[PDB]
Symmetry: D2
């Protein structure tokens, strides 16, 4: 037997950081969940009980807190690059660090029309994430994403013209509900190291904002021929707006809302043009994925 691949570390490390402007009194909070997995010359911990090569996962947890104390935690693309670089520079036998960060929303409260200096609201479960892989000699690969963005439009979605055979019961339609939970990932070009990541810092927040805006506008305005077609249009625009992105991936469930035929009850009309009451379906659901890159 041989170890073909090994990685280990600390998952589900919850971190909060507060920034206090002494000038203005204004406080800003950041809350994340962090995962760090390491690889390197660690095979003997598995094969020979040799713990001397193990940086304890508890020590990894400590490091995350220390790094957050001494560095900015935003944008998470920078924080994660700093964190991963740390492990491969500090430990000679560690050659890769895999850092995943989930950012939780704490949005400043408006009270009486004015931004409150130190109160916040979790205004939805949408997340901003990063995956950062720091590999000794091979630079820094960053995948940024948004997830848990739940949307619905009540009309201007169509689905017709699909393949019909002896397994098909689905009726063509020119007017349906479309609802999904958006998972969108943009993959940056490889960066040579931390100096290069630092050089692009302003692009990370801006690109996140553009991706969200494009997603929302396109969903709302597209007279959609299918989930496939709509999602392609989203990906095409993001790539057009940020040249340092190599690929954009979307993964979208099609969360079905079914018509309910009530005609058995006193001839009540609740289908097609007369559909007002629908049954949301918890399962099953369509799942549609696409990765779009440059020609």
């Amino acid at each position: 037997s041989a170890v073909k691949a090994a990685r280990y570390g600390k998952d589900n490390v919850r971190v909060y950081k507060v920034h206090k402007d002494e000038k203005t009194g204004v406080q800003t909070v950041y809350e994340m969940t962090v995962c760090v997995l390491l690889e390197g010359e660690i095979e003997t911990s598995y094969t020979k009980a040799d713990n001397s090569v193990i940086v304890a996962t508890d020590s990894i947890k400590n490091t995350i807190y220390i790094t957050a104390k001494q560095n900015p935690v935003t944008p998470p693309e920078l924080f994660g690059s700093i964190l991963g670089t740390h492990f491969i520079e500090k430990y000679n036998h560690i050659h890769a660090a895999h850092v995943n960060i989930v950012c939780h929303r704490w949005t400043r409260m408006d009270i009486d029309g004015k931004p409150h200096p130190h109160s916040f609201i979790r205004d939805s479960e949408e997340k901003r994430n990063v995956q950062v892989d720091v590999v000794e000699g091979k630079g820094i690969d960053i995948k940024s994403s948004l997830s848990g963005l739940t949307v619905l439009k009540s009309t201007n979605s169509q689905f017709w013209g699909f393949l019909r055979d002896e397994y098909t019961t689905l009726k063509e339609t020119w007017d349906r509900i479309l609802s999904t939970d958006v998972d969108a990932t943009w993959q940056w070009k490889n960066f040579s190291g931390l100096q290069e990541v630092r050089s692009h810092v302003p692009k990370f927040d801006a690109t996140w904002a553009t991706a969200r805006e494009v997603t929302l506008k396109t969903f709302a305005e597209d007279n959609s021929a299918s989930v496939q077609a709509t999602m392609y249009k989203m990906a095409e625009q993001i790539l057009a707006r940020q040249q340092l992105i190599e690929t954009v991936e979307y993964s979208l469930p099609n969360k079905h809302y079914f018509e309910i035929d009530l005609s058995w009850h006193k001839g009540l009309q609740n289908t097609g043009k007369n559909a007002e009451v629908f049954a949301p379906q918890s399962d099953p659901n369509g799942l549609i994925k696409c990765t779009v890159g440059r020609s």
Copy 2:
């Protein structure tokens, strides 16, 4: 053996309804999860296998859809009163209906600064709920609530002066983080029946809005001496603003964020006045409850 209490019905009935203004093109969606449990002269279904007294739970599900087709679904206090009244009027041997409604957020999207006519976003997991108990001869009792409103303030929360004995390790503090998931319930005065509920329809949305506003402002502005003290002030204001409410109940977890002592590492200062990085605790949590009524 005797049946001392019995109730039965359909839970987790998901319902969507759309309203279409043909004038303006504007669509509005409502999505709920509904539970209906019935009581009455049904003991023999349990004791004698006599199913003749059972209105099938499947029929209850059908009724919910039919009622939603033929009536307004908002405010949920009205919808639930209509639904419960239906069962006790229609079936001679059914004498109580217990209706629980959870309303899910579908907030109209702003695209380019303009309200979109038919696209929506789930802008958080906060819910608006109602519990309606319709009892033959005893009217309609309505409890309205908001839940899942998650908030945090980074300062202006204190906790000092509490009882100290040989079980106490907690240090007094003059500056801490306060974070909670708000569950707030207001109980209306008993209504004689549907005509009376209809007569008060405008008060339901207005009171929900006031309760939310009061909760948020009070949390943000109170230099809090304890969760207990802050929540009392919220309840006092709601009761003052709506005379048709008899009681207000709050149930608030105290979701702890712990300081992390980093002084073992190079003398790093991260406690008291120097606290910047904290560890959110998933469990355990304080749980603080209060019911406030009129003197």
Copy 3:
């Protein structure tokens, strides 16, 4: 405004305890989640910011650990009685303690046919719970329960003879699947205090075992006319077997498995007597409740 009711404490306190027999080498583990809420003369913490009446929730957490160190944690009915008695005896102004305990399964592993001395498996998510209310001057009220016991039978369940009207579409049936998650609660007669609870210690484990056995046998052997009828038979037997129980309550979802008509595809027969493939429904579900007591 006046405080009509108030309670506060610590929820979600996870506790593990190990017992080591030095004779035999055999270890036994117990794992619980505990909630303790207190009531008494504490209104001024809410109304006047008077924290002097508050036993901090952190201190409540400490107490739970200390009590578990110094006392047996099984049966949970005894542990919870000891814990609640502590608070009302120790603090003059605390007059009620409400203790909820959820016991998690750690079942000893069989390796090579022999019981292992110190390895355990979580052999399902079924829980054994207790709710203990200790009220100064009014003794100790104990509700014991099992929950999360998920069962299914593939035949010998019928549902016919129910009320049919213009809201009914459900077809009568003589052969269906029946599946549920059992929640069963037995309420003990009031106990005068801790000495009395101690006097009945052997009955707690025995009654839990009987309730589970009766539930399982009755479900498996009853040619069920309805959930209502089957659950009544379970409750009747428990009450017959343990005289110190006053009431038994069951709450049972009816988790539907629907036939799938495949006849549109090449005349495939998959309904009634020919039903082999079914669609489990996640929602909605029937919910059936009964409380049975003594005549």
Copy 4:
């Protein structure tokens, strides 16, 4: 812009199947959740709104039910191979099918010491899974797994000798609790097609059973030097026992149970040799992974 990768299908398809022996009266149930994603020449559905290349996801759902009606659903490795082969053979432009199956436990009840003919219990949340990738011209790749197997041992776990530096606070230990949720995957050698899979049918259930047995025995009997070391020993044995497996992967969380120092309270001794009461930690957790293959 170009489509670099695309896949789509139906997720969360819940399926139940019953087998009835008319001889003996004995019924056996199977319950799964199935996901099928397809790839092929479908780019134009995304880029040109050309739905003619789409086999509707609703039709995929129908197919799953039809296939389950006409074929055995066990072992899931066979069912998934049949299902995936179907799509690539039936549709000329579909060239890959990705089939994921989660099998849920329905274990026959023992009532009075005898196996019941048609009643079942969900005896834990452990799953048996398969991932089957059927690729036109490249055969059938099957990954089998077990997941959600939760275990704990109260002693005979050690962790000492690890790297200590200025980020390390963790104390070496010779006696700790070890608890994990086992996720174990075995990857079969590529199969040329369905005839070859059929030829190995008996090996699938047998290998699943061996993997579970080896996992459980090794966990219980190993005087563990680390999670890394213990998991390696599990993987080595599986590979030794089944030659048609190419790799074994384990992913194991280290779910921490912390000592609680109670010495501040009346000198109570609850650490090291005197540790009886521990605090289970919900987060963070160690995460340890290994892929082991043949030399």
